[PDB]
Design a protein around this ligand. Structure first.
Ligand SMILES: Nc1nc2c(ncn2[C@@H]2O[C@H](COP(=O)(O)OP(=O)(O)O)[C@@H](O)[C@H]2O)c(=O)[nH]1
Ligand SMILES: [Mg+2]
Lengths: 174, 859
């Protein structure tokens, strides 16, 4: 059934919190345990805007190589992406350029948000200052916590604004 | 299986609405590649070139074969190479490659792009082996200027993929200069922008691969000339890509850059930096950041290796005259719209100005401060905001004397800008004040400037939320830096600051994080609170307890997902402050511990407590530690949460649960009897749990020590079980041979000590109870005597030598005298009394052990 919707592919190292971020948005539940995603899981997230609903069909992909499934095959027809890493784990940050490259080789020009997750944890190893990923046109960075809900909506508001071409789109109380 | 059926599988994997149809197809594809790779590889190549298959399926056909040829994991990389080399027939390999080269030249770009990835993957496997020797000629021929646009573009893209993918070179032959092929596609004689882009991007992908070429002046001069021309192209995306290449070249081949910087690169990057086009200026700013970043890195390397043949050319340092004023001018291209949070050229300019300050230190001051002095009172807000941004941007790099001095001059005018009409001026001013607090807090004279800074922050908290947020951040810096001064001037302002922060925390929403940051600031206020400002801590705890109350008497059934998640963010914020209050001022909440525990239990009782459970468990545990005996009223209703926590033997929470058992045993002291039977049986099952994480075993073994020392004769029923756990633990060897595995055995052994010290202290009046185990205790003391990693720890030896003494004191009737005439015991006591190796406390305890040992032998 016709509606305003976008395919969003969520990628990033295992453990960085991709599935946890999606479930909170989906049901409000915070998942404590690590249960690695097998290939991909698809869920729709609906946001109510001042131009009515926007739907993101979120493909939550596996970050562990062993469980990758179709890998960059899942990116086919993606209209936007989120790359996630763990602010507490330098290796997950150092893999961001590769996740980025894998995305652009399949989706030449799409809007992408880099999310540095788990900022609720005392000592970060990746400081928000030193991020340079978001310096170009269709790219953006936010600190996020899937657990404290810091900057909960920002990635989706920024994506929606880019995809619709309206800089003053808001997420309104339905 | 036929082409069409395989295409159907591919298409259904990613296009079917039915999620089970997708899984099923994905599973069958993987099964096929496993069972019969030869067939799977052929079929994939056939779907890639088939006009009757949907686009998405053809792309997936290329991608999926590629992902069975190449991998992130270098073990699978070798298996994939060998499976291609050995299982696919020469005929099949030839067809597959032929089909790939046919897709490459498809009139559909997205098919061509996915073909390029497939070609790169095959090439990664075959080129080291000199298989596919036709490929390099085909790619070079395809990039000839006269070839069709799509053929040139797709082949440049493939060459680039191929080059960034070949192993740290070592495979790299003469016929077909790859460099000339790529650089020619970048020439201004190319009509097609798509081809020049493809060329410049392929060139960037190939820079590590073409190293030997770059080290030949002729080839290098030519490449630099073409890339530099490209920067001056009409098309903005071609310009971007040209500067993209320059950045990469500067950072890989810095060592060859002096001649080009002097001939033409310098003057053009300066000119381009004044461009009225924002994107064009950013590109050139990027290049100068890369230069700065490199030279900073070179300086670090040269400090660690002073004889290095590597030399800085100090490009950034030499450029200040020209670059810095142009950067400063770029600061006045801020975005008008306060709701736009995108990166723009003015932010690139600020970032680069900061790198310049770090690189060049004091040399940056004159041009920046000329600018600040000229613009801080300009009529245009853009010039006023650039002024403070420039000033804040040099608060790191120049020495402390210069920064302190210029802060003293600027600060009054900076503080006055908190009254500006312009939102963006106020927002940057609060940020600037923050930077001054963070890097040069002693520059803020306690008498002349601190009152003004505090007032500025207080005004800021009441302003636009974006300004407020920066004020909360600036307050945190002020307090973290000034709370440690010895005559500490900040505590004079705690009440004013706490009051402003509470007001900010009371905002109706969390626009621009104004509310969340206020709660972080409040956490800092609490963390650094001294006794002289105890009243203001009480304010904070009263405020957040009341706010936590509000958040829980909302109409749950009418709350949207959006509403609830905001509410839960606020509860997390609140708990951070309550944790700090409990850690720091446990006394300023115990008068209302009854209502605090009320809130905590209600929080835990809700389903959807998962996000906050641990926070609350930590909080209660730390509160329990402060209440002592006063916490016993909450134990019954806290019980199942403790047990849930004790049973998550894989979570860090169980470690603190064990700690909690230790705390209430120490506070209830003799009254811990009531709970001892339930606690012991739970601790017993945790320690003999296979899945218990490593830290639990010793934590448990120590807490047996605690309990026994608090509970005296009431420990006797557990004595026999616990002693068996200790014997078993003390005879366990390291799991392997690593440092890690050995350090853990010792951590276990230190925990057995704790158990035996506690038990001996506990059974002081009941020696008969300890008597049967004295042999086993000495077996342990013998291990302490034997292992350096135990005996050389001053604490461990003092405890061990203490046991020798204390056990002797317990049996004056001679019943254990035989343990005291052994060679190893005498020598251990002597050693513990001897060198400089152990401390006076340790030596005095050895002296006592020596006296008790002597008394035993004469019995
Ligand atoms: N503290 C904290 N933990 C998180 C956060 N996000 C996720 N986690 C935890 O980190 C683990 C990540 O699991 P998951 O979402 O499955 O990782 P994925 O492989 O990227 O999907 C889980 O145990 C989560 O509870 C966060 O923002 N803060
Ligand atoms: Mg997952």
């Amino acid at each position: 059934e016709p509606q305003v919707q976008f395919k969003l592919v969520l990628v990033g190292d295992g453990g960085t919190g991709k599935t946890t971020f999606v479930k909170r948005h989906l049901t409000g539940e915070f998942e404590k345990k690590y249960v690695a995603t097998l290939g991909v899981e698809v869920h729709p997230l609906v946001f109510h805007t001042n131009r009515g609903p926007i739907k993101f069909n979120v493909w939550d992909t596996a970050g562990q190589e062993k469980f990758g499934g179709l890998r960059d095959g899942y990116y086919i027809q993606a209209q936007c992406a989120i790359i996630m890493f763990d602010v507490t784990s330098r290796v997950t940050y150092k893999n961001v350029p590769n996740w980025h490259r894998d995305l652009v080789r399949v989706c030449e020009n799409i809007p992408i948000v880099l999310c540095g997750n788990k900022v609720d944890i005392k000592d970060r190893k990746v400081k928000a200052k030193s991020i340079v990923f978001h310096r170009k046109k269709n790219l953006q960075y936010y600190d996020i916590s899937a657990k404290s809900n810091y900057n909960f909506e920002k990635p989706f508001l920024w994506l929606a604004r880019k995809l619709i071409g309206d800089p003053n789109l808001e997420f309104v109380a339905m | 299986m036929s082409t069409a059926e395989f295409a159907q599988l591919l298409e259904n994997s990613i296009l079917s609405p039915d999620q089970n149809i997708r899984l099923t197809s994905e599973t069958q594809l993987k099964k096929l590649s496993n069972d019969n790779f030869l067939q799977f590889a052929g079929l994939s190549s056939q779907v890639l070139i088939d006009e009757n298959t949907k686009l998405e399926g053809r792309i997936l056909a290329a991608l999926t074969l590629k992902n069975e040829l190449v991998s992130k994991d270098s073990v699978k990389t070798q298996q994939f190479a060998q499976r291609w080399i050995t299982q696919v027939s020469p005929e099949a390999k030839n067809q597959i490659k032929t089909n790939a080269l046919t897709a490459l030249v498809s009139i559909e770009p997205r098919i061509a792009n996915a073909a390029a990835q497939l070609i790169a993957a095959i090439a990664d496997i075959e080129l080291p082996h000199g298989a596919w020797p036709e490929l390099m000629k085909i790619m070079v021929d395809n990039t000839g200027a006269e070839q069709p646009e799509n053929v040139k573009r797709a082949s440049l893209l493939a060459l680039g993929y191929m080059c960034e993918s070949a192993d740290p070179q070592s495979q790299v032959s003469s016929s077909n200069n790859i460099l000339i092929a790529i650089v020619q596609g970048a020439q201004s004689t190319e009509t097609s922008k798509a081809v020049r882009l493809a060329a410049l991007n392929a060139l960037a992908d190939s820079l590590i691969f073409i190293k030997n070429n770059m080290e030949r002046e002729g080839e290098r001069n030519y490449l630099m000339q073409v890339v530099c021309e490209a920067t001056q192209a009409e098309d903005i995306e071609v310009q971007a890509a040209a500067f993209g290449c320059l950045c990469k070249i500067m950072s890989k081949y810095y060592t060859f850059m002096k001649p080009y910087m002097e001939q033409a690169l310098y003057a053009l990057t300066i000119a381009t930096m004044k461009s009225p086009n924002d994107k064009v200026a950013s590109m050139t700013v990027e290049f100068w950041s890369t230069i700065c970043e490199e030279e900073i890195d070179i300086a670090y390397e040269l400090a660690q290796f002073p004889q290095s043949p590597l030399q800085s050319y100090n490009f950034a340092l030499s450029s200040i005259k020209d670059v810095v004023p142009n950067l400063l001018n770029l600061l006045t291209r801020q975005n008008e719209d306060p709701e736009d949070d995108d990166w723009n050229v003015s932010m690139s300019a600020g970032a680069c100005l900061q790198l310049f300050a770090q690189n060049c230190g004091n040399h940056i001051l004159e041009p920046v401060l000329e600018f600040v002095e000229q613009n801080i009172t300009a009529d245009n807000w853009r010039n006023r905001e650039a002024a403070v941004m420039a000033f804040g941007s040099i608060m790191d790099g120049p020495d402390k004397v210069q920064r302190t001095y210029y802060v003293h001059q600027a600060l009054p005018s900076i503080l006055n800008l908190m009254n500006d009409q312009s939102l963006q001026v106020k927002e940057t001013t609060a940020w600037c004040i923050g930077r001054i607090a963070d890097s040069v807090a002693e520059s803020i004279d306690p008498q002349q400037h601190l009152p003004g800074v505090v007032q500025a922050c207080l005004i800021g908290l009441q302003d636009h939320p974006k300004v407020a947020t920066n004020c909360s951040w600036t307050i945190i810096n002020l307090v973290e830096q000034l709370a440690e001064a010895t005559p500490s001037p900040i505590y004079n302002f705690y009440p004013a600051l706490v009051d402003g922060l509470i007001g900010a925390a009371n905002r109706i929403d969390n626009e621009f994080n104004a509310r969340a940051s206020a709660f972080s600031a409040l956490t800092t206020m609490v963390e650094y609170a001294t006794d002289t400002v105890a009243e203001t801590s009480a304010s904070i705890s009263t405020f957040v307890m009341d706010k936590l109350g509000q958040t829980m008497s909302v109409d749950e059934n009418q709350l949207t997902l959006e509403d609830a998640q905001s509410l839960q963010e606020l509860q997390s914020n609140i708990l951070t402050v309550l944790a700090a209050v409990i850690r720091k001022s446990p006394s300023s909440v115990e008068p209302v511990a009854d209502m605090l525990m009320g809130l905590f239990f209600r929080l835990l009782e809700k389903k959807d407590s998962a996000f906050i459970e641990d926070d609350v468990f930590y909080a209660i545990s730390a509160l329990a530690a402060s209440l002592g005996k006063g916490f016993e009223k909450y134990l019954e209703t806290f019980s199942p949460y403790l047990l849930k926590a004790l049973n998550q033997v894989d979570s860090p929470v169980s470690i603190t649960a064990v700690g909690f058992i230790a705390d209430i045993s120490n506070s209830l002291e003799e009254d811990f009897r009531r709970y001892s039977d339930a606690m012991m049986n739970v601790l017993a099952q945790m320690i003999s749990n296979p899945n218990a994480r490593r830290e639990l075993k010793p934590a448990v073994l120590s807490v047996f020590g605690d309990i026994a020392s608090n509970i005296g004769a009431d420990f006797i029923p557990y004595l026999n079980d616990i002693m068996a756990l200790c014997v078993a633990a003390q005879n366990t060897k390291p799991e392997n041979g690593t440092l890690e595995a050995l350090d853990y055995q010792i951590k276990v052994l230190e925990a057995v000590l704790d158990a035996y010290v506690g038990i001996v202290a506990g059974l002081h009046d009941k020696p008969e109870a300890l008597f049967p185990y004295v042999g086993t205790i000495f077996q342990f003391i013998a291990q302490v005597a034997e292992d350096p990693q135990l005996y050389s720890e001053d604490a461990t030896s003092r405890a061990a030598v203490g046991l020798i003494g204390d056990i002797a004191a317990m049996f004056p009737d001679g019943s254990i005298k035989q343990f005291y005439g052994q060679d190893w015991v005498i020598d251990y006591i002597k050693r513990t009394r001897s060198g400089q190796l152990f401390s006076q406390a340790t030596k005095d305890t050895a002296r006592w052990a020596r006296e008790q040992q002597k008394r035993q032998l004469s019995l």
